[PDB]
């Protein structure tokens, strides 16, 4: 279908857009060639079959992390040290490379798009955090705030200048580029995943390496729960008015939590690491997970 013959085993990311087309990233973390790819599925249930895809493209290197830049654009965190931007064509069959800027000196692990939509922030193993302009295609700022590999960065949903970051230096930094010293350290186990609350601009949750999912207010006193037995890879809130939190981990499970971090759902569907989760915008009770076992499971969350 005007795309690569075969996609890679390890599925790294899965995102839904407005209408309900499932974006897929994937890397080969084994075998002769260690490269990545991007895929589109107007039919979510057809995944991850390569013969029934709307769009698909092979990238130079692996895909560590991606996210939607609205409807057309796809921003990639590459192992090469490049942050790549791809854009769907007007037919939405091809995927042409917009930019591909080698600025990080090591693997780009995490990326997130800021409120404006013309800016993004990336985090790499070279310990830096960089602020991009997607229009001019240049780095606005470069920040060595952490003292170890940057794990996860997460843009504030309604504030352009604000974003979170976390690193193996055991720091969770809350940023605000308006301040001269932008970073602000929020006061045991290393933070691995971040997620802003969708309806509250001052609330966020973080998952750690030990498996604990926490609930933090920016003002004050925190709440937490031991959800997973191993590292929390990602956290994604549902599109509900009263949101449910979906937590994934390396213990090969999925858990859907309420507002007080009480377990509602449990899914031991995957056989390998669970890498991403994305709620269906059409049906808010559906949740799609992807993993290194090369499954694309669709969960019916009891809501």
């Amino acid at each position: 279908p005007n795309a690569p013959a075969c996609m890679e085993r390890q599925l790294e990311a899965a995102r839904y857009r407005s209408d309900g087309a499932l974006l897929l990233g994937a890397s080969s973390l084994s075998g002769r060639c260690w490269a990545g790819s991007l895929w589109l599925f107007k039919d979510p249930c057809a995944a991850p079959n390569e013969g029934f895809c709307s769009a698909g493209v092979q990238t130079e290197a692996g895909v560590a992390d991606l996210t939607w830049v609205g409807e057309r654009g796809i921003l990639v965190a590459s192992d090469s040290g490049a942050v790549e931007l791809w854009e769907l064509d007007e037919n939405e069959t091809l995927i042409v490379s917009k930019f591909c800027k080698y600025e990080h000196d090591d693997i780009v692990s995490t990326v997130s798009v800021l409120s404006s939509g013309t800016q993004a922030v990336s985090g790499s193993k070279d310990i830096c955090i960089k602020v991009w302009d997607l229009a001019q295609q240049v780095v606005l700022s470069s920040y060595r705030a952490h003292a170890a590999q940057v794990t996860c960065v997460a843009a504030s949903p309604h504030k352009d200048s604000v974003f979170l970051s976390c690193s193996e230096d055991n720091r969770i930094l809350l940023w605000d580029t308006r301040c001269p010293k932008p970073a602000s350290q929020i006061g045991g186990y290393l933070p691995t995943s971040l997620a802003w609350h969708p309806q509250q601009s001052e609330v966020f949750v973080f998952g750690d390496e030990n498996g604990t999912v926490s609930l933090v207010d920016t003002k004050s006193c925190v709440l937490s729960s031991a959800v997973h037995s191993q590292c929390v890879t990602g956290l994604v809130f549902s599109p509900h008015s009263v949101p449910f939190l979906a937590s994934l981990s390396e213990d090969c499970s999925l858990a859907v939590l309420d507002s007080s971090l009480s377990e509602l759902f449990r899914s031991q569907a995957h056989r390998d690491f669970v890498r991403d989760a994305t709620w269906s915008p059409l049906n808010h009770s559906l949740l799609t997970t992807v993993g290194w076992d090369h499954q694309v499971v669709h969960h019916v969350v009891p809501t």
Binding site: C179, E209, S229, E250
Partner: protein, 307 residues
Amino acid sequence: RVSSGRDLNCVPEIADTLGAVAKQGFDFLCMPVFHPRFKREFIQEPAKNRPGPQTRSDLLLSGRDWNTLIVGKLSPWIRPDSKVEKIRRNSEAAMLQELNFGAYLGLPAFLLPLNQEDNTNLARVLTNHIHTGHHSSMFWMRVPLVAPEDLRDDIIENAPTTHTEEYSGEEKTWMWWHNFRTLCDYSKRIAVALEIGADLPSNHVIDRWLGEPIKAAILPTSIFLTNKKGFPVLSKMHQRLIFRLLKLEVQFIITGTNHHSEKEFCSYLQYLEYLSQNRPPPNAYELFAKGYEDYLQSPLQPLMDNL
């Protein structure tokens, strides 16, 4: 003139990567044996029973290529001294696996990081590997001249950088090394890969590394200034350091992306060559002595013996 290598943490095709590196004038290539992000489980099901090949085939290169042109790298996720018991046990099994595969390939060297104070369990595992089968592979300990915490940007509002002169504290990375190599009991297989930072420390911090087994000197692309022509150069501070390092006859490794995008990547190496040629030439002493560096010999006894 100068022996140089290339550090990469991203190799999509091992055959293609070498060709590019070799064309630029590098002698060897530092690269991973397992994909940096390919995290593996060894205890808990079902991830421990993950199918398929764990990495690339040894057949992709020739035996000679592995033996002379490739330096191994421990994966970044491997943390043997983690506070979490699970991660510790997993990193142990992973470290042994990667080290074993290194020996299987017959790699001349393998890089392990010293990026924190406590590397005790790291040392305990490496020592165990050293006392296993048959291999003569060197282990280069990646250790920074200045710790990452001490060269971070002062941009955290409620955590400012230490603006105090701490004489002992600025020598901390040497203590990292010293403790490690003491635990390993001065193994001749364990040497230093000294990573040079943007801001060099005080002179005493550098003098600390005199008389240490420095085999490599890692040079990030970020530390290079740009001249009027628009090509990479170094400061007078770094120039004196490289001049000192050229006397020790170390192997210079280049790491990081091309910040001088307009030029080639050979330019970095060409500058080291430029420095190599531009040094004070060996005198009658150093010309004749060249060969007998740190070579132990018995004191002659012309009375007892007949010369």
